[PDB]
Amino acid sequence: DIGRSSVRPYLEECTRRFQEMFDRHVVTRPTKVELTDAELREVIDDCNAAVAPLGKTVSDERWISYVGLVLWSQSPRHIKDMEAFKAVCVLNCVTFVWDDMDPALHDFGLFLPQLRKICEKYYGPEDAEVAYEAARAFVTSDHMFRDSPIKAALCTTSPEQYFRFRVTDIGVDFWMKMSYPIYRHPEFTEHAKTSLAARMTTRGLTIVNDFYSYDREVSLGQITNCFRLCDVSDETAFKEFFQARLDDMIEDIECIKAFDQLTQDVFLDLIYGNFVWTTSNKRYKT
């Protein structure tokens, strides 16, 4: 169905409605962390060093585009450890590269030691092991589920099964487990380590990403996108599905407000910051 090849007809209204929802339920805007020139050079140098064994040359412009996710979606008022912050910048960037690679070019023997080097550089020993395991689990999951029947079943059955897959696959469990050292906040550290932090934020991250990455993904034959569960060529069907997804986001956001003040700031800054970054990034345009 060529009518289902694009969500472009809904682009402007959906963007407006996402923003309206955030203004009504989160209110406080995300803020962009600013890196010094020295910090941004350090981050890019580490990204280039990590993907060089895989034969990939990545421009500064591409790295800076991927790093904007971290700059916009962390919680600047609560940052305590800028070394952990740089680590998340590097790890976020290089796993975008992995996510985009053909699996024939994936090489664990070459890439996993680079992830370990990044973690050992920026984290103390215990946190380094936690961040590295989460990175390893994510890149392994991305690899093993390429064209997988498990992925097919979880992504075609219901929203419940799909979001369950995405807790790992969209990277948010990884994100929380490498981000808690930024904040040094005992409650958030526990929610990161139980993955409750990831489970609370999966839908709000995923629904936004899926909307803006739909056209690209379906053009590439990728099935990991919740809007494939609906007939996007039927305007009534799309409207009902989109509203059900907005309701999921709102329910999660209202439950996130029961968490402690710092933790809920981190969770909400992540979901809203991802939206601000997604709508500004050429990755998601045509």
User: Which of 24/285 has CB closer to Mg ion?
Assistant: 285
Cα separation, 250 vs 245, in Å, equals 9
Binding status of residue 231 toward Cl ion by CB under 5 A: no
From 1-9, 52-60, 68-76, 131-139, give the range in contact with Cl ion by CB under 5 A: 131-139
How near is the Cβ of 137 to Cl ion at its closest, in Å? 10
The DSSP output letter for 30 is P
Binding status of residue 133 toward Cl ion by CB under 5 A: yes
User: Which of 116/216 has CB closer to Cl ion?
Assistant: 116
226 binds, among Mg ion, a copy of itself, Cl ion, none (CB under 5 to 8 A by kind): none
User: Which of 136/199 has CB closer to Cl ion?
Assistant: 136
- Angle CA 207–212–217, to nearest 5: 95
Cα distances (angstroms) measured from residue 254 to each of 248, 268, 285: 10, 10, 30
274 assigned binding-site residue: no
Q: Which of 10, 5, 25 minimizes the C-alpha distance to 241?
A: 10
Cα separation, 212 vs 143, in Å, equals 23
Cα separation, 63 vs 59, in Å, equals 6
99 assigned binding-site residue: yes
Binding status of residue 148 toward Mg ion by CB under 5 A: no
Cα distances (angstroms) measured from residue 99 to each of 138, 238, 242: 10, 28, 26
The DSSP output letter for 2 is G
* Footprint on this chain of a copy of itself (rule: CB under 8 A): 129, 133, 137, 140-141, 144, 149-150, 152-154, 157-158, 160-161, 164-165, 167-168, 173, 187, 190, 193-196, 199-200, 248, 251, 254-255, 258-259
How near is the Cβ of 127 to Cl ion at its closest, in Å? 10
61 assigned binding-site residue: no
Cα separation, 101 vs 79, in Å, equals 32
Q: Which of 209, 263, 264, 278 forms a contact with Mg ion (CB under 5 A)?
A: 209
148 assigned binding-site residue: no
Is there a contact between 197 and 264 (Cβ–Cβ < 8 Å)? no
How near is the Cβ of 129 to Cl ion at its closest, in Å? 5
Binding-site residues for Mg(2+) sit at 99, 209, 213, 217
Q: What is the binding site for Mg ion (CB under 5 A)?
A: 3, 99, 209, 213, 233
